Amino acid sequence: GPLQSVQVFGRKKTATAVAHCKRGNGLIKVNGRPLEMIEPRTLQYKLLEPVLLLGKERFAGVDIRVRVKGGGHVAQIYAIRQSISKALVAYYQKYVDEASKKEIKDILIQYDRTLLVADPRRCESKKFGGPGARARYQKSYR
Amino acid sequence: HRIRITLTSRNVKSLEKVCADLIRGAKEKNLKVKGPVRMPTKTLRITTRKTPCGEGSKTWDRFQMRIHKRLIDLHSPSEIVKQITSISIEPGVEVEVTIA
Amino acid sequence: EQMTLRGTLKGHNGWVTQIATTPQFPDMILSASRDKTIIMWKLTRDETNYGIPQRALRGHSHFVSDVVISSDGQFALSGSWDGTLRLWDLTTGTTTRRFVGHTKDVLSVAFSSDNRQIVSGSRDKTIKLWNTLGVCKYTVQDESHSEWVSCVRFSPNSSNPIIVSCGWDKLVKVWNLANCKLKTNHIGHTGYLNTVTVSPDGSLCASGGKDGQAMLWDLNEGKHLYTLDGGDIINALCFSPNRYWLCAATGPSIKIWDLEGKIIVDELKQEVISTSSKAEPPQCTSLAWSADGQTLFAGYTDNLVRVWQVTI
Amino acid sequence: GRVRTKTVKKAARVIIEKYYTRLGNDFHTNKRVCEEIAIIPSKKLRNKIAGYVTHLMKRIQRGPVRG
Amino acid sequence: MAVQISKKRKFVADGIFKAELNEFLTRELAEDGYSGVEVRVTPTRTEIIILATRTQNVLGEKGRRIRELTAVVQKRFGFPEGSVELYAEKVATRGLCAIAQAESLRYKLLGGLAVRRACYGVLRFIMESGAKGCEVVVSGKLRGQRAKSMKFVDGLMIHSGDPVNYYVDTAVRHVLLRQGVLGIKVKIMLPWDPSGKIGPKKPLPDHVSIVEPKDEILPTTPISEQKG
RNA sequence: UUAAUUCCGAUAACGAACGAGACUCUGGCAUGCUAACUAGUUACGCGACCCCGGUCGGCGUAACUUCUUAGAGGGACAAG
RNA sequence: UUCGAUACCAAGAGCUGGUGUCUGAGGGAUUACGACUCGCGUGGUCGGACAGCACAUGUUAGUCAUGUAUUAUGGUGUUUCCCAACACGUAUCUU
């Protein structure tokens, strides 16, 4: 069979995750490791959210290679859970039924919006006279 | 044949004028040209106190100076683009040409 | 008799702006919306939905202004507000070629009868026509519209290789494709012109403006025939491919006239009255005849396409 | 805190009184009309002017506009 | 070359060169009607353009002053001989140069024209030159030992925002009088012109201009204009 | 009523100016555009290993611009 | 059951599109020439149309101006370095 490749990303924080979706059998791996080995393990289910909800029936046609950079631990975990979900929606509209994508999008978006839409918040700048963005140094009377 | 022109300026649209001028030159003289590679900008940042003395409320100035860089590669002998690079020199933009 | 509704098509998120029908695939339409998507459909004519969206043609920057099918059925040319055109194949909906040169918004696009010429009307005072490999053949700005060239339309009867142009300076301009130059101006209108459509027999043209007066000019001659006061603003005009009917989108209603006796054949408001509680109704934006002229599609403002059929 | 200043309001009233026949109910078309007819020097000001134009004109029909 | 300064240190060195040069020319040619400097580093040349108003005096006697200034600027800044060619250019519409007015007022006040009469005299020259509005402040020890600040404004003057950068031309100066330093602050708001000669080309970011419609006449009944 | 002498209303006041707002820099969006051996990707050939595949910041040059860079425009207005 | 339109191929036709032969209408810089500054060298700037031609000369224009070779203010030919048919001009090769 021919080319069925799509690369889609997911940002939540300074971090970014990019997922290379392509036809094969079901295999989802982040910087080599399977999704059971990406740390911290406390956020196991947060990575399994799109798998657990869409089922392995929808994933088993294609394999995804995720690659991550920037930000921290929680950030990159919210980046990868976004990246694989967005990649599959983008795949399932470009190469198979438009009703199939409509089915996926409506299921994912109504459980939680953050699987598709990035949270636009970024660390606000510091200004003089204070140790953070808004908190100020201690003024002394008498 | 791999001549490289590095255009550097504090003004962006004056840099883009000279950059868009040299590509027009290379194309109208029938030469292989790698488009302008926008190298990351550098922000010369100096933050001073505002008061000359000591006894004003603690206020700081934040002086910035952005410096911008394009480089355009050309596969041609020296003396053709020498005549082009000599054309359209602005007071703002700074040109450095290497041969190999 | 009359024209009656069955149901609506739900596949757009922005306002549907234009529809393009092919005589080869009567269970397939294309509709251009006020998002960056052109929806190709697959019409089942079933109970839950008359048609289901089969394909999403994405890859524009702004609102898609016009969509036009080829005679083949394997090219759909589209024009958008980013000044680009996209010649696309409906096999997958992937990109083949894109047109650049127009500066402001491109408003209306059109193919030739031989699928060998493009022509584009824009918000800059220019009618640009292209070869099929997306380089500018000719632009006309000199003896052209002083305001926006809203709509441009090529000859169905190209024995006179003509083109008709309605703009925002309240004239219609007829041009010779021999040299792409001005032949006759059509002065008489009282407001900017939205649409101009040529009769499928390629003999006379109907011009619909703001005021809501549909004027029939001649193309055999440079002369006027008669007028049809639809009442409300005429958004989009469409002509019956078999019968001698006009179909005009007079604001929130589409009124179809007979031209033999100047009387309304039928009037079409969606009497499913939804705006009964203080607001303007969602109005029809464009409309398209099917393969035969038995089935009318009408694109409306509220992200809907309603499909009417002549019952008798 | 979306109170339009005298600049946006006066510009809107002057644009309608001179060019009533072009401006309509749609925000996006009369954004493009105001863009062409008025040499407005910034994009956010053009959007705020165009915004208030398709509020005044959407109430002219209802009736008794004063200014 | 061998020392091979970074772009950061090079561009700061280029800036400081202009800073010390502007200081030198302002100190010397203050009483010769000098506007400003422009530095074109032509291929193996350094073509310094001096903007003046009375260009015969910044020129000297058979170009004695220019040859004098070329010799010392070559000597201090360590350029090679011949690679430093000065060019005196008198500015058109001197009235709209803040430095020309501030340094002229200075040499009137220390000359012996009255403070009130000097300020009014400069103010009237600027508004007839065609500035949109001007402001001349003269502060220091006026009419005895305790110091005052006299403020002479006529026309429009803006104070806040970015347009202050390219519409308001300023000049702060000191004059030597016997009681002490008199501080001068001259502000000139420039007029806008699409030409870009005397003022800026960017119109004020809230000055909205409306095209007036062509008062045409509607065609009552359909006509046509057939040709070929 | 507004963040605001910000507007609408009342109205012997009408029409304006400075400050406010606009403006400038930055933050976030583009699977659209112009471009990248001083950014990288997807393939591809060789090379190592585990049992055709898996991993490779091991190597090397055909497509490209999603990922990175900085230019232009688009985008949001109380618009629905 | 006769009257006129529709799914197709054969007889060549035209058109449009590709390709590009060719002239340059033009478009530009700068340097020719034109000036203004001059410290005498440049510098600034009109950037080929504004610039001048030698009565050389492309045409004729009131037949009255002139004072009847005549230069009217025929106002257009000679003539520098580039990109040049959206100047849709046309060769050839094809749809």
UniProtKB/Swiss-Prot annotation, chain A:
Subcellular location: Cytoplasm; Nucleus, Nucleolus
Coiled coil: none
Highest taxon, organism lineage: Eukaryota
Keyword Nucleus in annotation: yes
Gene Ontology molecular function: RNA binding; structural constituent of ribosome
InterPro entries named among the record's database cross-references: Ribosomal_Su5_D2-typ_SF, Ribosomal_uS9, Ribosomal_uS9_CS, Ribsml_uS5_D2-typ_fold_subgr
PROSITE patterns cross-referenced by the UniProt entry: RIBOSOMAL_S9 (PS00360)
Residue numbers carrying N6-acetyllysine: K56
Pfam families: Ribosomal_S9 (PF00380)
One cellular component (GO) term of this entry: cytosolic small ribosomal subunit
Keywords, alphabetical: Acetylation, Cytoplasm, Nucleus, Phosphoprotein, Ribonucleoprotein, Ribosomal protein
SUPFAM superfamilies assigned to the protein according to its UniProt record, in alphabetical order: Ribosomal protein S5 domain 2-like
Biological processes annotated in GO: maturation of SSU-rRNA from tricistronic rRNA transcript (SSU-rRNA, 5.8S rRNA, LSU-rRNA); translation
Residues annotated as signal peptide: none
Record Gene3D superfamilies: 3.30.230.10
Subunit organization: Component of the small ribosomal subunit. Part of the small subunit (SSU) processome, composed of more than 70 proteins and the RNA chaperone small nucleolar RNA (snoRNA) U3.
Function, in words: Component of the small ribosomal subunit. The ribosome is a large ribonucleoprotein complex responsible for the synthesis of proteins in the cell. Part of the small subunit (SSU) processome, first precursor of the small eukaryotic ribosomal subunit. During the assembly of the SSU processome in the nucleolus, many ribosome biogenesis factors, an RNA chaperone and ribosomal proteins associate with the nascent pre-rRNA and work in concert to generate RNA folding, modifications, rearrangements and cleavage as well as targeted degradation of pre-ribosomal RNA by the RNA exosome.
Swiss-Prot record, chain C:
Domain of life: Eukaryota
Cited Pfam families: WD40
Organism for this UniProt entry: Oryctolagus cuniculus (Rabbit)
PROSITE patterns referenced in this protein's UniProt entry, alphabetically: WD_REPEATS_1, WD_REPEATS_2, WD_REPEATS_REGION
Keyword Cytoplasm: yes
GO cellular component: dendrite; nucleus; perikaryon; perinuclear region of cytoplasm; phagocytic cup; ribonucleoprotein complex; ribosome
Lineage of the organism: Eukaryota, Metazoa, Chordata, Craniata, Vertebrata
Gene3D superfamilies: YVTN repeat-like/Quinoprotein amine dehydrogenase
GO biological process, one term: rhythmic process
WD-type repeats, residues: 11-42, 59-89, 101-131, 144-176, 188-218, 229-258, 279-309
Residue numbers carrying Phosphothreonine: T4, T8, T94, T275
GO terms, molecular function: ribosome binding; translation regulator activity
Sites bearing Phosphotyrosine, chain numbering: Y50, Y226
The name this protein goes by in its record: Small ribosomal subunit protein RACK1
Family statement drawn from the similarity comment of this UniProt entry: Belongs to the WD repeat G protein beta family. Ribosomal protein RACK1 subfamily.
Residues where N6-acetyllysine is found: K128, K181
Residue numbers of Phosphoserine PTMs: S274, S276, S277
Gene name as annotated: RACK1
Cell location: Cell membrane; Cytoplasm; Cytoplasm, Perinuclear region; Nucleus
UniProtKB/Swiss-Prot annotation, chain D:
UniProt keyword Oxidoreductase, yes or no: no
Modified-residue entries (N6-succinyllysine), positions: K18
Gene Ontology MF term list: structural constituent of ribosome
Compartments in which it is found: Cytoplasm; Nucleus, Nucleolus
Family: Belongs to the eukaryotic ribosomal protein eS17 family.
Assembly information from the UniProt record: Component of the small ribosomal subunit. Part of the small subunit (SSU) processome, composed of more than 70 proteins and the RNA chaperone small nucleolar RNA (snoRNA) U3.
Stated name of the protein: Small ribosomal subunit protein eS17
Protein species of origin: Oryctolagus cuniculus
From Swiss-Prot, chain E:
Activity-regulation annotation: Endonuclease activity is inhibited by MgCl2 on apurinic/apyrimidinic DNA but not on UV-irradiated DNA.
Compartments in which it is found: Cytoplasm; Nucleus; Nucleus, Nucleolus; Mitochondrion inner membrane
Annotated positions of the Phosphoserine modification: S6, S35, S104, S209, S224
Cited Gene3D superfamilies: 3.30.300.20, Ribosomal protein S3, C-terminal domain (3.30.1140.32)
Description of post-translational modifications: Methylation by PRMT1 is required for import into the nucleolus and for ribosome assembly. Sumoylation by SUMO1 enhances protein stability through increased resistance to proteolysis.
NCBIfam families per the UniProt record, alphabetical: PRK04191.1 (NF003219), uS3_euk_arch (TIGR01008)
Protein name: Small ribosomal subunit protein uS3
Species in which this protein is naturally found: Oryctolagus cuniculus (Rabbit)
